[PDB]
Amino acid sequence: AKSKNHTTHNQSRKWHRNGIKKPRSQRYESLKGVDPKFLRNMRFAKKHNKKGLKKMQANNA
Amino acid sequence: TNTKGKRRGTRYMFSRPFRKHGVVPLATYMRIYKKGDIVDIKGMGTVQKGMPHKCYHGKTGRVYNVTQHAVGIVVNKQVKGKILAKRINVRIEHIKHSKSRDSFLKRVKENDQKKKEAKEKGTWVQLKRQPAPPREAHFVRTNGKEPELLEPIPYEFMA
Amino acid sequence: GRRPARCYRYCKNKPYPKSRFCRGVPDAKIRIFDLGRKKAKVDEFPLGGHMVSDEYEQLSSEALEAARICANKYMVKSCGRDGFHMRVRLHPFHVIRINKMLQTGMRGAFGKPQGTVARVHIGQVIMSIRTKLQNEEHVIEALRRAKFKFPGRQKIHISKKWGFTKFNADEFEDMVAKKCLIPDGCGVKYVPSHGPLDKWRVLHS
Amino acid sequence: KENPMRELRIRKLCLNICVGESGDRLTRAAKVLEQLTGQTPVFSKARYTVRSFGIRRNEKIAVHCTVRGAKAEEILEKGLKVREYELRKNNFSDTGNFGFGIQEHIDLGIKYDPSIGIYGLDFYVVLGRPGFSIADKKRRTGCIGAKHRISKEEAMRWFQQKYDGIILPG
Amino acid sequence: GFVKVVKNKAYFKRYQVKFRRRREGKTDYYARKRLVIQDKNKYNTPKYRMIVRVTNRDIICQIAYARIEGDMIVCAAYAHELPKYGVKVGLTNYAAAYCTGLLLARRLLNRFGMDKIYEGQVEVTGDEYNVESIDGQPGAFTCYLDAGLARTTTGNKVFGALKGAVDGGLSIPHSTKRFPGYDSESKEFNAEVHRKHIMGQNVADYMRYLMEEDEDAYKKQFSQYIKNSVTPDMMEEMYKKAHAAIRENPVYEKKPKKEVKKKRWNRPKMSLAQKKDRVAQKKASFLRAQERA
RNA sequence: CGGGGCGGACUGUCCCCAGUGCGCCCCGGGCGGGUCGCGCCG
RNA sequence: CUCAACCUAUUCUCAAACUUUAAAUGGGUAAGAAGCCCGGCUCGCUGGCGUGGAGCCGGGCGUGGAAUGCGAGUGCCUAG
RNA sequence: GACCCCAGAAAAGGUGUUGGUUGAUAUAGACAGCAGGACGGUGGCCAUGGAAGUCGGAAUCCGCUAAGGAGUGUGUAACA
RNA sequence: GAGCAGAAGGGCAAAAGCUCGCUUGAUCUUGAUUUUCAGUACGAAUACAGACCGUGAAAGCGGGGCCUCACGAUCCUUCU
RNA sequence: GUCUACGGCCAUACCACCCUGAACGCGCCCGAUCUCGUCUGAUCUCGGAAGCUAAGCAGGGUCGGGCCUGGUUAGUACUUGGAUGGGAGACCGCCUGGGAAUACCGGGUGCUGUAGGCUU
Ligand SMILES: [Mg+2]
Ligand SMILES: [Mg+2]
Ligand SMILES: [Mg+2]
Ligand SMILES: [Mg+2]
Ligand SMILES: [Mg+2]
Ligand SMILES: [Mg+2]
Ligand SMILES: [Mg+2]
Ligand SMILES: [Mg+2]
């Protein structure tokens, strides 16, 4: 009739068999969840990087 | 059997320290948080808006977003056999700058200065931290005074 | 209709005081904790003797009452009704429960209050008697007799303190002389050398 | 000798008429206070329902007003005429304020009216020195300090000196 | 004794003091948080404000932005420097509040170089005016009124300082509900009685009102007005000359500090050795007086 | 463990009684670390 | 004269659902090249200000910035 | 009596023996034995039917003394 | 040591309590996130963004109740 | 050496009582025509400048309470890991590392940012 209710016994042994891996961090994390007003302005800044290229290469040279 | 309430078991966790109740000091609202800096999540209970969940109290994360009153923090959370990066919105009353990153950033600037000076002067200097080495050989003077004899004291029932 | 004390000898539970959560607790059997000449001044009874437990255990309020009466009767016989002062230094603040059997079995087995016990630690003082110097042998015998009312192992000790105070008997008198101590009923008041000078001027006058 | 900024003065007078119930009795009482002060009084309600007194919570029970300045000094003299300048010793509180009562309001200097009744009232003179208002100011409010306070003995001395009053040893 | 001592040892052990400037009754920290704290997505952008504090004898107008190490005042103008420019008497009134608000605006704009641009309303009229930024030019300086603990009802002098600053060229958000010309019943702004208040015509009306009724009360009230020979018929022109002088030269020249001998006026703190000696001497005097009997 | 000369403050010994710090300079005794230190010994 | 309650200074004994204080063991993060430092360019966001913030483009820096050990990363199908 | 878990024991006792702690007496004669004395006021007071040291309530002294409690027990109705 | 609707805990003093004045942010929208979690849903919650408003002199605050509870798929119906 | 305006940390800053306060200031203070609020010009708002440091405020004092920081308590309490350690148990000791809190006894009694004054 009655049986065991709950245990975390042997759970930690199972977790560490394949390791508890930290999430794979890498360059260029995603922009999900960032402020929409800030985000749509950065798109305008990226779009208009074309102009001022002549000034950039003049300064770099 | 345990309830699933969002603030179960936070009776002392979100309570204010002794004789530190009342108005929140204003410099906590004047801290500048940018994208990429490391912040400890505390979770004070005077402000009930933007409270982090109790599983993030004491955790440290990295800011990825800044709003008018809060920040978005990427903070690791361990769920059974996996760790996954949560993103939480926390008002600035419940965070503070982590000094571990400040200490390391200080040591980087000192290291780059030390390399710069050593190259321009003509020296090589150890920049890595080394673990505490075994003690060096030394002489201990008695100064003409014999060491004091120590003996265990007799037992007696104190009180 | 009380269980044998062997069923509640050990501190197995957490402390379970009578509070707003534990209600319906019967009164402890011991209600009197001081006997003899409780009104005697501090310098009348310079000798202090303790019964000290050596076991981390529980003593029932029934046993404390029995041992209190047993020590009182011997002290009265050998020292008179005003030749001593006894203080029981254990209070039965822990409620023990009983799961009363005639639903049947272990279902809903949490018990109802049954009585109260005092939790005693190793080296803790159970009982104290203060008296004159010439009654040292009578105090030891009185405390020895009261040992038989308790489950564990207890030691009789003659304290180096003066009476029921916390000051040593070999420096008590000259502290009173130099006004570091002032009697107040059965005890003393320690007056430190700090505070308003008006208190100091109340002394020395 | 004394600093001129320490002389005692009257802050307010605080007349009060506690009628038992609400209605035409209370309206007549407020009429009496208005005739006495030239100044519209305010009704006060009952904190709690007490049926041994016959009152209920939030029911208009009493009427009161506070008078300051020259008009207060005039009304106090009118009240002290009735008392014959005889205030008992215990009428003075430990904070330097005193008070008394009168049983009939007609002898205050108000002509009788058949419609209006026989209302009595309470006088409560609140004494003060210049500078007492710092406890009431909004910005940088403070206390007045120990020397600047008024004791029962100083209030009694002021009454004896100013109104040549008699303090009965009651 | 009959009653428990409320302020016993346990009371003081658990007592938490409020903030120091709350205990002195100088700062409303509920208002200060909403008013000095910048949005976090604006980072180190300063949030400027105009602190208007009216004193028993002075008007203080400052512009500050909050930092962690304390506030930073970038421009301050006082009403006690008004004798340099026209008006010499009758400070801490509505007309002087306008003058010091205008002086603060002109002083700050001169510090930033935005003088010719953002002149403001040179011709003083009481109606609503709000400076607009000019394209191709640096934007208008924006700050917010900080009234402190003042009760902001219609006619308060802090709104006189605000009116001077917005007419000086500063952009401060406001409504004309709190200017003296506003009428609560009709819910309309007169804008002409407000101009009179700016020009001190209500004070001039009082002077001639007292002149006709009781000359003794007139002397008692405006005693320092007979000195310096200020009359009601010349009040308005005096304030207009004050405005023009403020416009022409708002630069503050700090008075050079004089040589002073270093003097200790307040008693220094007694040392530990002195305190112990004082206790020993007091004890000795008690014993000596006792043996005298 | 202390000695000299000027400024405040304290004491129910007040006669110009007694005692305590502080700021500047002149001396004295003791302790420790650096010193091309300098010598002598191992 | 005496006993109550009251107040004051003490005194005995306690708390899973009390607490000023407060461990040990424990939990998170950091210990660089995706870093640091220079210049410049873009922005419709922000704005006293060539102001802030973010993004982008060039350049120079390697003593590879604790110990120890180990080769890692990633996908599909899947039984019990 | 005889070895983790583990398969049987407690309070309380012992002039069995062993070690330890504290104290006391003693050549000014300990201790134990054997042998003498163990007195007067006073058969002290209050208690009662009788309580004389010895059913009890209080007192608790003095002289002679080497010493002898106005009493440690047995005993008597009380004595003895 | 009161009060904040209620259970308890947290929090709160020119507050979050009390009294007034004006109001309807308890409204219209798209996503993101947190909580339970399988990292599914519901419920609840957090931070924004776009409208239209309220209030205040303004900074601001407000898309319900100071926070932790107060609730509900497919199919069908009904309204907009 | 101080003060004012605005503050940061939020008692080393608070609380009780006493003493002193030069100059500016800050106040108390005088009045209700206007602006504006009241039962009450007490508060608030406004217009002032005869008087006063009595109060607030500032500084100092008190074998002051509190608070802050040390010593002690104490290598004590508790505790990581270990043993075919002890003990009928309850519990205790040792090894290996970490290590408190009262009482009691000392010392201290706001630092400071920006702007602007006074101080022969
Ligand atoms: Mg199962
Ligand atoms: Mg049985
Ligand atoms: Mg149990
Ligand atoms: Mg406000
Ligand atoms: Mg919106
Ligand atoms: Mg809410
Ligand atoms: Mg103290
Ligand atoms: Mg250990």
CA distance E233 to E199: 12
A52: left (phi over 0), alpha (psi -120 to 50) or beta: left
Q: Are B61 and B89 in contact (CB under 8 A)?
A: no
Task: Collect all residues with Cβ–Cβ distance below 8 Å to D134 and sequence separation of at least 6.
Answer: D140, D141, D142, D143, D144
Distance from CA of B32 to the nearest CA of E (A): 6
What is the distance in A from the centroid of ligand 5 to the CA of B67? 14
Q: Are E93 and E59 in contact (CB under 8 A)?
A: no
Contacts of B65 in chain A (CB under 8 A): 33-35
| Distance linking the first and last C-alpha atoms of chain E | 32
Distance from CA of C37 to the nearest CA of B (A): 24
Nearest to D123 by CA among D36, D30, D16: D16
- Number of Cβ within 10 Å of residue C38's Cβ equals 12
Site of tokens 């029962």? D152
Q: Does the beta-carbon distance from C204 to E290 stay under 8 Å?
A: yes
Note whether B150 contacts C: Cβ–Cβ < 8 A: no
Looking at residue C10, its amino acid is: Y
Q: DSSP alpha helices (H): ranges in D119-167?
A: 152-162
Q: Are E257 and C175 in contact (CB under 8 A)?
A: no
CA distance D110 to D81: 13
Q: Roughly what angle, to the nearest 10 degrees, separates helices E235-248 and E201-213? A: 150
Provide the sign of the torsion angle of the four alpha carbons C192, C193, C199, C200, taken in this order.
Answer: positive
Q: In the 8-state DSSP scheme, what is residue E112?
A: H
CA distance E195 to C97: 86
Nearest to C88 by CA among C11, C142, C26, C141: C142
Contacts of E151 in chain D (CB under 8 A): 138
Nearest DNA or RNA nucleotide to E280 (CA to C1'): J63
Nearest to E221 by CA among E203, E198, E199: E203
Q: Note the residue count of chain B.
A: 159
Site of tokens 């506003």? E182
Greatest Cα-to-Cα distance within chain D, rounded to the nearest angstrom:
57
List for chain C the helix, strand, coil content (%; round to 5).
25, 25, 50
CA distance E290 to C200: 14
Site of tokens 């302005």? A41
Q: Exposure of D106 by Cβ count < 10 A (0-12 exposed, 13-18 middle, 19+ buried)?
A: middle
Task: Collect all residues with Cβ–Cβ distance below 8 Å to E134 and sequence separation of at least 6.
Answer: E117, E118
What's the Cα-to-Cα distance from D84 to each of D80, D127, E251, rounded to whole Å? 6, 20, 70
- Beta strands (DSSP E) in B80-155 are 82-91, 95-97
CA distance B157 to C7: 31
Note whether E287 contacts C: Cβ–Cβ < 8 A: yes
Q: Which residues 36-55 in chain E show a CB within 8 A of chain B? A: 36-41, 43-44
Please count the residue pairs, one from chain D and one from chain E, whose beta carbons lie less than 8 angstroms apart. 13
- Number of Cβ within 10 Å of residue D42's Cβ equals 11
The ligand with the least distance to the CA atom of E151 is 4
What is the distance in A from the centroid of ligand 6 to the CA of B50? 10
Note whether E280 contacts C: Cβ–Cβ < 8 A: no
Instruction: Tell me if there are at least 3 CB pairs under 8 Å linking chains A and D.
Output: no
Q: How far is the CA of B51 from the C1' of I25 (A)?
A: 21
Nearest DNA or RNA nucleotide to E18 (CA to C1'): J10
C18: left (phi over 0), alpha (psi -120 to 50) or beta: beta
Nearest to C129 by CA among C167, C89, C166: C89
- C49: nearest CA in chain B? B159
Q: Exposure of E237 by Cβ count < 10 A (0-12 exposed, 13-18 middle, 19+ buried)?
A: exposed
Nearest DNA or RNA nucleotide to E277 (CA to C1'): F20
Q: Are D141 and D121 in contact (CB under 8 A)?
A: no
Q: How far is the CA of D8 from the C1' of G6 (A)?
A: 37
For residue B88, the cross-strand partners are B73
Nearest to C37 by CA among C99, C86, C4: C86
The ligand with the least distance to the CA atom of A7 is 1
Note whether B47 contacts E: Cβ–Cβ < 8 A: no
List for chain A the helix, strand, coil content (%; round to 5).
40, 0, 60
Contacts of C204 in chain E (CB under 8 A): 286-287, 290
Nearest to E38 by CA among E67, E61, E75: E67
Q: Exposure of C141 by Cβ count < 10 A (0-12 exposed, 13-18 middle, 19+ buried)?
A: middle
What is the distance in A from the centroid of ligand 8 to the CA of B155? 20
Q: How far is the CA of C78 from the C1' of H67 (A)?
A: 29
Q: Are E105 and E248 in contact (CB under 8 A)?
A: no
Instruction: Report the neighbours of B using a cutoff of 3 or more CB pairs below 8 angstroms.
Output: A, C, E
CA distance C155 to C137: 15
CA distance C45 to C36: 12
Give the 3-state secondary structure of E126-174: CCCCCCCCCCCCCCCCECEEECCCCCCCCCCHHHHHHHHHHHHCCECCC
Q: DSSP alpha helices (H): ranges in A1-61?
A: 11-15, 36-47, 53-60
Nearest DNA or RNA nucleotide to E138 (CA to C1'): G48
CA distance B24 to B12: 18
CA distance E232 to E95: 14
* Token representation of residue B16: 């204010």
Which positions on chain H have an atom < 7 Å from some protein CB?
11-12
Q: How was this structure determined?
A: cryo-EM
Note whether B82 contacts A: Cβ–Cβ < 8 A: yes
Contacts of D141 in chain E (CB under 8 A): 25
Instruction: Tell me if there are at least 3 CB pairs under 8 Å linking chains D and C.
Output: no
Nearest to B86 by CA among B111, B108, B61, B103: B61
Helical (H) or strand (E) element with C34: strand C34-36
Distance from CA of D99 to the nearest CA of E (A): 25
| Distance linking the first and last C-alpha atoms of chain A | 84
Site of tokens 């600053």? E165
**Resolution number, Å:** 2.6
Provide the sign of the torsion angle of the four alpha carbons D70, D74, D79, D84, taken in this order.
Answer: positive
Looking at residue B116, its amino acid is: K
